[PDB]
Amino acid sequence: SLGFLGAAGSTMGAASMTLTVQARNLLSTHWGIKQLQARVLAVEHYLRDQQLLGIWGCSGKLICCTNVPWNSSWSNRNLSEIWDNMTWLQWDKEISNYTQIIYGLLEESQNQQEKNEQDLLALD
Amino acid sequence: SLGFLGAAGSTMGAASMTLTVQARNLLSTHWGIKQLQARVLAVEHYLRDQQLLGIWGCSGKLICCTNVPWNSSWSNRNLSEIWDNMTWLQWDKEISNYTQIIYGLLEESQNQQEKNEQDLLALD
Amino acid sequence: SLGFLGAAGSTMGAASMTLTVQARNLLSTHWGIKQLQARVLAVEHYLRDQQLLGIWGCSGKLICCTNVPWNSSWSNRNLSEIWDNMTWLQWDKEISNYTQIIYGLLEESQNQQEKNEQDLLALD
Amino acid sequence: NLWVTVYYGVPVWKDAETTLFCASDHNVWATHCCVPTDPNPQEIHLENVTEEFNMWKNNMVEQMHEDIISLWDQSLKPCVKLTPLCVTLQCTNVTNNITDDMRGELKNCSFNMTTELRDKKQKVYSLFYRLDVVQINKEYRLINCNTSAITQACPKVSFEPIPIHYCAPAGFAILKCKDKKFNGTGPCPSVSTVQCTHGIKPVVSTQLLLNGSLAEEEVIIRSENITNNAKNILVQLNTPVQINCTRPNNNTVKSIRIGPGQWFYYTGDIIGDIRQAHCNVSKATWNETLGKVVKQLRKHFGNNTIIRFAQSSGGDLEVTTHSFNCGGEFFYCNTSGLFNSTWISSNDSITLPCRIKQIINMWQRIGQAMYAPPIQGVIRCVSNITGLILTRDGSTTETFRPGGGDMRDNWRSELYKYKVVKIEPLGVAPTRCKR
Amino acid sequence: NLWVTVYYGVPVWKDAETTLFCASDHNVWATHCCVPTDPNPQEIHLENVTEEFNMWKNNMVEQMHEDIISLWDQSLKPCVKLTPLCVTLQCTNVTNNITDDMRGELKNCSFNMTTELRDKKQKVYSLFYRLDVVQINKEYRLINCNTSAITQACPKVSFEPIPIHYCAPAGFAILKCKDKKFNGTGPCPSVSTVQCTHGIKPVVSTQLLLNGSLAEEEVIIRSENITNNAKNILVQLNTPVQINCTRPNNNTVKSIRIGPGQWFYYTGDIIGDIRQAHCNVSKATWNETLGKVVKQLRKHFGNNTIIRFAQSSGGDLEVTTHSFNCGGEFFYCNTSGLFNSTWISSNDSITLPCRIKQIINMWQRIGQAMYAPPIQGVIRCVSNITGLILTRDGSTTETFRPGGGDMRDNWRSELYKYKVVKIEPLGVAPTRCKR
Amino acid sequence: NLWVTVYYGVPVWKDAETTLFCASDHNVWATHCCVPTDPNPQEIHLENVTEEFNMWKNNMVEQMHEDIISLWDQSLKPCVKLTPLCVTLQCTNVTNNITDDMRGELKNCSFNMTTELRDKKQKVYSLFYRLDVVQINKEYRLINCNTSAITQACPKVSFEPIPIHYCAPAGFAILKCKDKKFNGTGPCPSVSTVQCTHGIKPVVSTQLLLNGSLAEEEVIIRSENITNNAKNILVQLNTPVQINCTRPNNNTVKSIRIGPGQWFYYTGDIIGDIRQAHCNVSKATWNETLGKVVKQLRKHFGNNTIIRFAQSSGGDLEVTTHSFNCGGEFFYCNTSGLFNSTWISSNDSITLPCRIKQIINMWQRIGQAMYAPPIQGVIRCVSNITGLILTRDGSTTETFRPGGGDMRDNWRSELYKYKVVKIEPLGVAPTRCKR
């Protein structure tokens, strides 16, 4: 592979081929306190991202598809425009405003899905 | 909506739609040690509940239906009483005596299910 | 009916039924530092094992069947010779030289699996 | 025909004890050690939740006590040690401009103390307040010489209370009681959830509580057991009583080197007449305040009975007289003019005489003494009396006296509205759903 | 046609080095720094598991050593420094009531000591045990006024060994060897898993090991390398030998103030006659004990040899005599009466004379000296010899001597059954299923 | 008809501040506080990535600054205190072997010093360098007596810099700039990712930076704002200039006991001629070096502008005079011989005279003074000048002078290549996939 973050600068549809690579590096006398704080902090960040995925309905997946439609008001591009002629750093800047909107929609959709599953399982 | 525990006191049924609100707010000079201890406990709790959900086969869900039947000896109540005329604080107190029994049964059921799945895959 | 590691020394087959027993016991003035280091280390090890299961697509299971075929170069025993006539301590030593080969293959297999699924959903 | 369903994120909790951290918003509380607060805190009202509170079994009080003491001690770690002052003092009376109220209160002492160089000494003259000097046999020694080490408080560090907000760690929450006329031990019908408490000022005092919260409608009398005469009674006032305190003397403060990198501060002289320190409480306001207190006491002790107020029965000055930190000086103000009345079913003020002491022994500890350097100029402070600490004597007439001295009571008064609970998000219930 | 299957919760482990913590069960060590033990600890026997143990490469011992020294040092942090005692002492030996055993073993010294006030001095008379006082050129000084500085131990803090349990963190476990006649280095056919060790008393001694565990059936001789004369031999007895130690002198203890909150304790005088400290070991029990040791030594050196016991070849008192803490007092007993015999293939006791020393340099360190306050009255203690420390010399006769010290070999006698391993729950194996 | 897809492991980041730890590579910069470096550290080139760097707002510098001060202070914590030396000294001149370069640079001082015993005194004499002694009214005192406590540096602890690597915590990464001829503030077209920085030696100096990295091809002139006279200019050389420094006197070192467990080190006498300390550089190398600096400097000033160099205008010795630690001694060298020229469109050295000072006040702090014990024998060191710190005067011929006094500038000089970013693996994008 290109190594950790070696894909940066690559277009989105190519960079996404090596997501595993950046996942494994998230978990890898003050002197002792500075080190404990650094270790604790890495764990807290890891867990917060994992919780967001769990709430949204994604558990161990690096790639997951949801039931929330894309709004052209967030971004109006040719799709190929994004995947073939743009990198992830650029994309992240482009839609940073809509981050919380999208996340809120992701939580709402999953909550509705869990309730619907429960009712269907009860039927027999 | 209601930012945190707002549903406390509402019926068990009504409160089922705010599970997201409480879940997302979990885990969110030697006065440095007190701060580290607090941060660590925030992680040890939470992570411990995630393990139970893992063991029981509920690792990715806020609502999880299992294959363990309900025993009237734990609580002999009408579902309409439980879901419409009680809140969760009251419910938890009524069955706080059977929590360990139920948890043990949930672990046994999931373990049997994983073994059964492995045998079916082997046969298929 | 066994406590922690009580199955050690039993055959691999027999020991596979106590996985829950070991799993549930994970996590479970310089003195402030020693306690924080002990707690932090236990958490870090737990999380690294979970991350790895996550990458492989085994995050919710104690027994996880994957898509990587077994190579006779790692071990050429019969399944009886393994499951009925060996314990896990012995097995781990026998194949300790292939551990990173197997793990790399597992990561690759799951990444291929995720891509295939994403494309099928997009297809129809 | 029902199955177990597991739910995560269930809005329930249990009573719990955890460690809280401070958030604040140079000083003796080392507030730079706290995590700055959120400019937009939230309070979530919990409709239909009734909780049991017990202010007397509340461990938030114990933590506040432990941290206030710890912060206090840490602030003295880098300060000048005054070991060189434990020498024989030669003392005579200050007689030049005395009103005869302060007869013998000040003493003009001289002594041999060290200089920057170890081979040289200097003669130092300074003033003491009698309470802080004890006679040896005109030969005197400081009161701390046979019990403790003395440390000079750093002159750059303020003792003024700064509001401290206590915040629960993630996974915990603090429930607040919103009910009016709540005495701290019963069920509380209206509660809300907060993450951080109301800021609390670590005001230190005895006999009367200063600069605290006020009761919403009426005087509230709180006690662990009202019929147990051995318990303190915490009375929260509805309206404040204004008190104006002063040390009406223009002090000239001088300093000298006592060793490399270290200097000692002392009162050099006094400009003009020497007058007694005192506090002013309006008579009408104070008499109305007691009438309100008595009415509420009668609800427990009887209409057809008599309530009498009296002075503390005796004991150490730190307990029996009113005490506070005013401008950085430590005052010991007599309450005899406040609690002298029998209650049976005008632009004038009560003047309370006060003494000043430079050697301070806080938190009722022995072996750790602090020297409060004197302050140049004239000191005046105005504060609000927001509550009282009373005890009761062990017939038809009950006698109440000022009490306290146990600092946990001052805090307990401010923290009575809060309890800490652990959130327990995981639980089960029967449903018709199975898999 | 087999596939990889991943299993989690697999009962396997690897040897590992981690940090263990203490769990408890007015003490010198901070027992308050430890977590209380499990009221119902478990032990799991692992059937059909054989593990390799090596007591000489055990890292639990190294941590125990480090923890004890640190705890010890913490206990002296708040205690009075005795720097002011480093003055010329004027001494003339006590000769009021002696038996010629103690002639020259006590000294009556006087000196000019400081007082609370810096202006005053006081003359102090005290008794010393000679070992602590060294001639300067009748002019003497304390022995530790050049190489060190002396801190007085706090008189209220006890040196009595309190058993401390060691516990592994989650993710780690301790494997305990339960095999009779186990020498500490081979495979152990019967093991069990515990989370915590039994409590181990931190008894400090040389020559002989006191108050430890006994062997199940026979004397067990353990060594890193039995033919290497550079190594010590640890001999575990299967029976205790009772030893009765005393300081039969009724001391009158006096104290003076030396500064503002500091006081020094010393022996003032002796009531009655002056007698030597000593320990009593029964001859029959001791001779039976050596016979058992000799039989077990012949198994390693030959059954046609001669085993000879001798006293120490020389060196510092701390390594040539039997050092122990008795009632808080420090004893240095002569073992020549125990190890003086050649073995060839009715209340009759052995009396070991003992000396008393007050300035103690613990853990073979330089620069940290402790002063042991005197104990009023008379001291008697009874303890069990549970093992020996022997060395071997460079013919047909093997000569052994008591060898002691290093404060790692004593611990190894208790921490030999335990090994720390890391739990490794994840692994793979071939099977029939795929997905 | 597009759907939201969630991706994890996305290679993106944001600027961030965090806590870094050291990985190293008996010494002040304790390595006991660090972890080992990887034997094989990695570096990843990022194709098509341009990042913005700003070395003047780089928080890695602030953190390095604080770590160094903390390590420095810890290294003195257990060392001998020299309070007993702050006595009147009786001094005469050292005139025995003077070349008139050293006239008045050495004093011969006698004093009454403490001893191991509290009741004894000793007469001691030693040599001082004038810079560390101030006249009281032949009665002198050490310069620190009226401002600070003096602590002797431990003779066993080296001041030799050890290159220290800084490492980011998991979840963070350090981006490094590989763009040659990069000025530190613009976009950097060629970058790479590392986890740890190169090891940086914490070399302390003013005016001339020693033992740093060199520019790859050309002299690089970096400044926050080149037209702001309040800012310093950091000039990185593309070639080293060799400088040879010496303290050409054979010192005989003496040591005395000053109290129990403590001893003081001082120069006893000098064998042979007394010579002035000095540093040499090549005239040709230095003149070529400035020519290169001037050529590049002109880019911001024009070819119609004359560039002149001058000596610092004044201020404290620690700022105006070049300084460094050589052999353990602290040198103060005069650079006026280097910066005295006007630039208009063979075996011959420059000798810079130097002074030695034993009392050190680093990081311009008051109250913490260090005593540098003497180094026995003769000192010689060789080092490389790798950059300059210059300032600019406030209608033609711009004038530049040596600058410094703020250590963060030396660190910025090495830390201009790195920035810390937080990794943000989670994000979303539209796809044709739904579920």
Ligand SMILES: *[C@@H]1O[C@H](CO)[C@@H](O[C@@H]2O[C@H](CO)[C@@H](O[C@@H]3O[C@H](CO[C@H]4O[C@H](CO)[C@@H](O)[C@H](O)[C@@H]4O)[C@@H](O)[C@H](O[C@H]4O[C@H](CO)[C@@H](O)[C@H](O)[C@@H]4O)[C@@H]3O)[C@H](O)[C@H]2NC(C)=O)[C@H](O)[C@H]1NC(C)=O
């Ligand atoms: C090997 O193992 C043995 C057995 O455990 C140890 O022997 C014990 O050692 C302890 C500590 O020295 C002894 O405890 C002390 O006993 C003193 C006497 O009290 C007894 O006898 C009187 C007789 O009048 C009775 O009234 C009383 O109830 C007791 O039965 C006490 O005076 C001591 O207390 C004083 O010191 C402590 C601080 O240490 C203070 O806190 C107290 O206030 C007080 O001033 C103390 O309790 C115990 O008696 C010994 N047992 C036996 C059988 O002799 C060995 O020490 C151990 N070997 C080694 C090397 O550690």
Ligand SMILES: *[C@@H]1O[C@H](CO)[C@@H](O[C@@H]2O[C@H](CO)[C@@H](O)[C@H](O)[C@H]2NC(C)=O)[C@H](O)[C@H]1NC(C)=O
């Ligand atoms: C950096 O950008 C260059 C383009 O300037 C990328 O190179 C192209 O890659 C595609 C796909 O393999 C080829 O079809 C083109 O012919 C290449 N162009 C050139 C000029 O070589 C390069 O892959 C990008 N680097 C990274 C890491 O993504």
Ligand SMILES: *[C@@H]1O[C@H](CO)[C@@H](O[C@@H]2O[C@H](CO)[C@@H](O)[C@H](O)[C@H]2NC(C)=O)[C@H](O)[C@H]1NC(C)=O
């Ligand atoms: C607290 O209890 C009251 C009383 O049961 C709840 O009020 C009911 O709310 C529903 C929904 O708005 C109405 O349809 C009912 O008519 C109300 N009942 C009455 C008697 O007025 C209230 O919602 C509960 N609070 C919470 C947070 O659940």
Ligand SMILES: *[C@@H]1O[C@H](CO)[C@@H](O[C@@H]2O[C@H](CO)[C@@H](O)[C@H](O)[C@H]2NC(C)=O)[C@H](O)[C@H]1NC(C)=O
């Ligand atoms: C200095 O002040 C002391 C009080 O602190 C004076 O002592 C009192 O003197 C009067 C008159 O003789 C006695 O009636 C009191 O009983 C004494 N008080 C105490 C506590 O003993 C002392 O006389 C004053 N000295 C001078 C010179 O004014």
Ligand SMILES: *[C@@H]1O[C@H](CO)[C@@H](O[C@@H]2O[C@H](CO)[C@@H](O)[C@H](O)[C@H]2NC(C)=O)[C@H](O)[C@H]1NC(C)=O
């Ligand atoms: C504070 O109010 C509570 C009621 O909310 C009082 O508690 C009752 O006290 C009586 C004794 O007089 C008991 O018999 C009741 O069982 C208690 N009820 C409850 C709910 O606890 C309490 O005594 C009051 N205390 C003060 C000082 O006023």
Ligand SMILES: *[C@@H]1O[C@H](CO)[C@@H](O[C@@H]2O[C@H](CO)[C@@H](O)[C@H](O)[C@H]2NC(C)=O)[C@H](O)[C@H]1NC(C)=O
């Ligand atoms: C403790 O017992 C073990 C046997 O379990 C001894 O180990 C043997 O030592 C000999 C030395 O000549 C070796 O050749 C053998 O290979 C070792 N066997 C095993 C199984 O390790 C050990 O030396 C004994 N130690 C002591 C001090 O008695």
Ligand SMILES: *[C@@H]1O[C@H](CO)[C@@H](O[C@@H]2O[C@H](CO)[C@@H](O)[C@H](O)[C@H]2NC(C)=O)[C@H](O)[C@H]1NC(C)=O
């Ligand atoms: C145990 O100690 C003996 C020494 O008592 C070691 O044996 C020596 O080994 C060296 C190197 O091979 C030889 O040159 C010597 O001649 C041997 N001496 C004797 C008396 O045999 C032995 O190697 C040590 N055992 C272990 C495992 O380290």
Ligand SMILES: *[C@@H]1O[C@H](CO)[C@@H](O[C@@H]2O[C@H](CO)[C@@H](O)[C@H](O)[C@H]2NC(C)=O)[C@H](O)[C@H]1NC(C)=O
């Ligand atoms: C370092 O290089 C940057 C360019 O990368 C210089 O910044 C530019 O300065 C001009 C004025 O001369 C402005 O118009 C541009 O907008 C600036 N660009 C950026 C990206 O900041 C900077 O002045 C140079 N600094 C030094 C010391 O040479």
Ligand SMILES: *[C@@H]1O[C@H](CO)[C@@H](O[C@@H]2O[C@H](CO)[C@@H](O)[C@H](O)[C@H]2NC(C)=O)[C@H](O)[C@H]1NC(C)=O
């Ligand atoms: C860089 O430095 C120049 C000084 O040479 C700054 O320019 C001055 O800015 C102030 C404030 O707006 C004006 O009052 C002066 O008249 C300006 N001086 C000149 C010569 O133009 C400039 O603002 C600084 N730039 C930055 C980004 O700090």
Ligand SMILES: *[C@@H]1O[C@H](CO)[C@@H](O)[C@H](O)[C@H]1NC(C)=O
């Ligand atoms: C239901 O609970 C009772 C009481 O504990 C128990 O005896 C009974 O066996 C339980 N039912 C089943 C099916 O196990």
Ligand SMILES: *[C@@H]1O[C@H](CO)[C@@H](O)[C@H](O)[C@H]1NC(C)=O
């Ligand atoms: C040990 O081996 C015996 C057969 O000899 C077997 O019955 C027993 O179950 C085994 N022990 C364990 C823990 O499996």
Ligand SMILES: *[C@@H]1O[C@H](CO)[C@@H](O)[C@H](O)[C@H]1NC(C)=O
């Ligand atoms: C200072 O010491 C001298 C010693 O001769 C003594 O006479 C004098 O009274 C002392 N001064 C004071 C104020 O104690």
Ligand SMILES: *[C@@H]1O[C@H](CO)[C@@H](O)[C@H](O)[C@H]1NC(C)=O
């Ligand atoms: C105490 O000091 C006096 C000073 O005159 C001296 O004569 C005496 O010997 C000293 N006492 C002792 C015990 O050294």
Ligand SMILES: *[C@@H]1O[C@H](CO)[C@@H](O)[C@H](O)[C@H]1NC(C)=O
């Ligand atoms: C100790 O000596 C005194 C003085 O000679 C004597 O009277 C007393 O009896 C002696 N005590 C003993 C026990 O010998």
Ligand SMILES: *[C@@H]1O[C@H](CO)[C@@H](O)[C@H](O)[C@H]1NC(C)=O
């Ligand atoms: C030491 O003290 C004596 C006191 O009499 C004095 O005469 C002498 O000059 C002092 N010596 C020095 C070097 O200061």
